[PDB]
Every structure is written in structure tokens, then in C-alpha cells.
Amino acid sequence: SDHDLKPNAATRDQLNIIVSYPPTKQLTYEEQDLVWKFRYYLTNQEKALTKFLKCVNWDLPQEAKQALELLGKWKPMDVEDSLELLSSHYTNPTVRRYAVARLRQADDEDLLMYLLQLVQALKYENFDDIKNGLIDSSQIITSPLPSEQDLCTFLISRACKNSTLANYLYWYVIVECEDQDTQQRDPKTHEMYLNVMRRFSQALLKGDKSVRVMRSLLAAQQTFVDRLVHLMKAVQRESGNRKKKNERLQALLGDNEKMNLSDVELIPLPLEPQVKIRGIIPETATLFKSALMPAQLFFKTEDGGKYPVIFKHGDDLRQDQLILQIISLMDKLLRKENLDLKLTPYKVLATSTKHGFMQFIQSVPVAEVLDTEGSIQNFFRKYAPSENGPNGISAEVMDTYVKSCAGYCVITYILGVGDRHLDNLLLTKTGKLFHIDFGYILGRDPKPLPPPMKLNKEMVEGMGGTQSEQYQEFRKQCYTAFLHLRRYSNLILNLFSLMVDANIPDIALEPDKTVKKVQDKFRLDLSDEEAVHYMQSLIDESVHALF
Numbered sequence: 001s002d003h004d005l006k007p008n009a010a011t012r013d014q015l016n017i018i019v020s021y022p023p024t025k026q027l028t029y030e031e032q033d034l035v036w037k038f039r040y041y042l043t044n045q046e047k048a049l050t051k052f053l054k055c056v057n058w059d060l061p062q063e064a065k066q067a068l069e070l071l072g073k074w075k076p077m078d079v080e081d082s083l084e085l086l087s088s089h090y091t092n093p094t095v096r097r098y099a100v101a102r103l104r105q106a107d108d109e110d111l112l113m114y115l116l117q118l119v120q121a122l123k124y125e126n127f128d129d130i131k132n133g134l135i136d137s138s139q140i141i142t143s144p145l146p147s148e149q150d151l152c153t154f155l156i157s158r159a160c161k162n163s164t165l166a167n168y169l170y171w172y173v174i175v176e177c178e179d180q181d182t183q184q185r186d187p188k189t190h191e192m193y194l195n196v197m198r199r200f201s202q203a204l205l206k207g208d209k210s211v212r213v214m215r216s217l218l219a220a221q222q223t224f225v226d227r228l229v230h231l232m233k234a235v236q237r238e239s240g241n242r243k244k245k246n247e248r249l250q251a252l253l254g255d256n257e258k259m260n261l262s263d264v265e266l267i268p269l270p271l272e273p274q275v276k277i278r279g280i281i282p283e284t285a286t287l288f289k290s291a292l293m294p295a296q297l298f299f300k301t302e303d304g305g306k307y308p309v310i311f312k313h314g315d316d317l318r319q320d321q322l323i324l325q326i327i328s329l330m331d332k333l334l335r336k337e338n339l340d341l342k343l344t345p346y347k348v349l350a351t352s353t354k355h356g357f358m359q360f361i362q363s364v365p366v367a368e369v370l371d372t373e374g375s376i377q378n379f380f381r382k383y384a385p386s387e388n389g390p391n392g393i394s395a396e397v398m399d400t401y402v403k404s405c406a407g408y409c410v411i412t413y414i415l416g417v418g419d420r421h422l423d424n425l426l427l428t429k430t431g432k433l434f435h436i437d438f439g440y441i442l443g444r445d446p447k448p449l450p451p452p453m454k455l456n457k458e459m460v461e462g463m464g465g466t467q468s469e470q471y472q473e474f475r476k477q478c479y480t481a482f483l484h485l486r487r488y489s490n491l492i493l494n495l496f497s498l499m500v501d502a503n504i505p506d507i508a509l510e511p512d513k514t515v516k517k518v519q520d521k522f523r524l525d526l527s528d529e530e531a532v533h534y535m536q537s538l539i540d541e542s543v544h545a546l547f
């Protein structure tokens, strides 16, 4: 009978094909029947488990009960794979608790790489269960009352043992609580996120000194942000020119008795909680010349250093927050494969749907380089000369430039980043090239029929042109980066599957086609050799057009 079945050669080949499918591939009924039929054989293969859970007819109490028996005996699946089980497709509680049990084995560092997506996955959990575990959401943490695991319980549990996790959990959830589209369209989901914040507060107050200190520092952050938002509103309300608005900004910031933003108790920076701040430096704060006049603010740190940020008001940072979170992931995966491409995954954090922070990286827009110095090479010559270096430039700086160009050319191609011009391409004096301002992703562009590979002429000239050694190395780094990221297609696709219901504009336009737009870029229909030539074709087609 079914438990004694062992598959012949032909059937093994078919099973390996099914098991190798991406996580998004809908299995046909024939595939489902075959995986069910050889379920006891497949218990030995951790990778077959997600396929098995998609072949069960859960409506039949017979199979359901047997499937859970097999789930418990199955060779434990990898952390990366468990993320599939938290998507909207799975409602069975025992399956969803299994996924969490797998996440429990992850280190905190990996857990932090996936956290933004895990907070979105709370939408697919049981709302009643979250509520039964127990209102202006921003006042929960600031209004303490005196004196197996589901996903909510897990994340709160890990947040209590890790202040960096706690910080991102707090701010990610507060933005979901504050989201007015969710309030207006999905009231239940809004309620659930309130209840999560109430559970989180509750657990923090139940805990030992360690945890209760954490809670009072989140409150200190929340009220600091509230006070800074109040100050930005005051600055904009006041008509008058940019010089006048700067003067008002610096005066309000210099009045600590009123606004209390220039001397605080070494609280964690929400943008980067590892940086502890004394306050904002009044006399150096100024507004950018742009429609929404965000501010550049220098925070004084515990060691007496300065950490510059951009604070934006009246703008939704969540699409940019998602892209920089994924770039950060992609950079970590490449580094784990011993490939450091000198990328610049600057921090972005939404403190609401209407405001947030970004890390200010010292750099010059390529347009300004062209305007002041004429070319990327002249810029490197001026600020990093070297008599015997390539084209009179320091070898380290050129090495960094070639790698960062390649890294970004492959990453912006995978993420489908549009609206690329010389004011959103930035450069440092150490040779790092990077992208900012991701308001167009996943194939969207303000123009029609945009080129798939976003490489321009001044980038190529920076490498010394198409006949240089630098250009040959650029190509190699591009195709090598592409093959590496393809090996992590499952993780990356699984994470995007958890974003399909987020209110991110370029996802919300076509939620159901979102994952495929990423998946197509990997060209998983091609072998590694073929994918290398496809990438070379992408570079050749772009460079030919440019000249």
C-alpha cells in the first residue's frame, strides 16, 4: 500500500522536475497526484515539502489529518522555504505554526533581513487569535498602564530579546496602524495591526528590566518623531522664501525648552537604532530646494560624531523603503558568495505613511559632476589622482567604480527600476556609484517602451570606454552577479509573494502580476551558460543604442 511505494527511474525524473519548480508555479492535478502518491518516499527530501503541502486536498478530513502526520515526520525544510507557508495561500493553522517553528531556528540577523515582509504576513494570520492574546496607535507605547507560537507571538517574543528587531517591529507596525487606505478599505486589517501593537506593548511591560527599558526608549523615539513632525509643519505653514524657512527651522531647533529636539537621553535613531543620538544640531539644518522641501538634519551621536539624515514630510516612503531593504538583502547574499560589489544600501525608514527618514550619503549627483568637472573620469582625477593608475585614477577607486556600476546594473534590471537620469545616479569620491529615488519600479516608467538595461554613456566613459580593460571586468561582474542572485530566486520570490497586498503603488497597480515581473527577470527558463549570454546581450544592446 501507499507507504511502501518506491518510484522507478522515470518517475524520479518527473518528481525532481516538480520539486525544482519555483515557489510560485501552480502545480497541475497530475503533478499533485504524483507528489501525493509518492509522499512517503519524498519525506526524505526537505525541498519536496512545500510541493507536498500544495498537493493535499484539505477539504477531505482524511488527507488533511494524514498530511499533518507526514508534515511532522518530514525532514525539516530550510528557513528560506518556510516563508512560502506564510503567504495568503495557506490558512491551515498547523501549517502556519510549522512555518513559524522553522523561523525560530533562524539567527536574529537573517530574521532582520526578512522582517518587513514578515510584518506584511500578519495580514494572513488569524485575527481572532491575535485579539484573544490580549485607541490612537502612536499613543500605545507612550501610555503604559501602571504597576505553539503563531507569527504574532513569535515576532513579539524575538523582539523582547533583541532591541534592533524590536525597533523595526515597532516602526513597521506603527506605519500599518497609521495607513489610512487600510482604515478606509480594510477595517479588519487595521484593527489587527492595532491589536498587534497592543500585544507588543503588553509583552514589553510584562517583562524583566531589560525589556521594560526597551519599551521606554521606543516611547522616547515616538515622541521625538512627533515633536519633529510638529516642527516641520510649523516651518511649512510659514510663507516666505527658502532662506526665511531655514531661519525658522534653525530657531525652533535651537529652542530646546519648547521643542526638546537638541538634547535627548542617548535614544536610538529610528532609522538606524545602533546609532544613539544626543539631539539635532540646530545651526546646520537646512531645507532642500524641491517641491516638498524636506530637511537635511545632522544628529549629534554619543561619540560626538554627526550622522546626517533627510527627513521628508508629506510623502510616502514605503516603496523606497522596500527597494532599499531588498538591495540590502541582495548585497548580503552576494557578500555571502564572496562578492562585495561596493553597493550603497542606505537606510530608509517610514515613520508614518506621510513622513520618514533617509540616510544622507556624502556624494555628488552625476549631473553635477558633468556640470562642474565634465566627466566621471575628470572627477576621479581631481579627487583621487594616481600617477600609475588606470587613466591617472587610483586603482582602488576604479575597482570600486567598476564593481558598483555592475552591481547596480544587474540590481536595477531585476527590480525593473525606471525614471533613471543623471540626478538620481550618485557618485562618491571613493568610486562608489549608486541609485536613489525609486518611485518607478517593476517595469513602470514615465516614458513609453523603456530600455530593460539602465546603462548610460557617461557610465561607460567613466570606465574608460568600450575598449578598456575596466569594461571587460564590468561585463564579467555583471554576469557573475546575475548567476548568484538567480541561485537565491526562491527566497527573493518568496519575499515578494509576501508583499502582494502591501499598499506600495507599483505593486498595488497589478498585485497578481507582481511576482512574475520579478521572476521573468531571472530568466529561470535559461541555463547558467545561456543566462550569461542573455546578460551580455542586454549590455551590448544598450551600449550600441548609446553610441
Ligand SMILES: Oc1cccc(-c2nc(N3CCOCC3)c3sccc3n2)c1
Residues within 6 Å of the ligand: 310, 320, 346, 358, 359, 360, 361, 362, 363, 426, 436, 437, 438
Ligand atoms: O530614495 C529616495 C527617494 C527620494 C529622494 C531621495 C534622495 N536621496 C538623496 N540622498 C540619499 C542618499 O544619500 C545621498 C543623498 C538625495 S540628495 C538630494 C536629493 C536626494 N534625494 C532618495
Ligand SMILES: [Cl-]
Residues within 6 Å of the ligand: 058, 089, 090, 091, 092, 095
Ligand atoms: Cl491550507
Ligand SMILES: [Cl-]
Residues within 6 Å of the ligand: 286, 287, 288, 296
Ligand atoms: Cl541642502
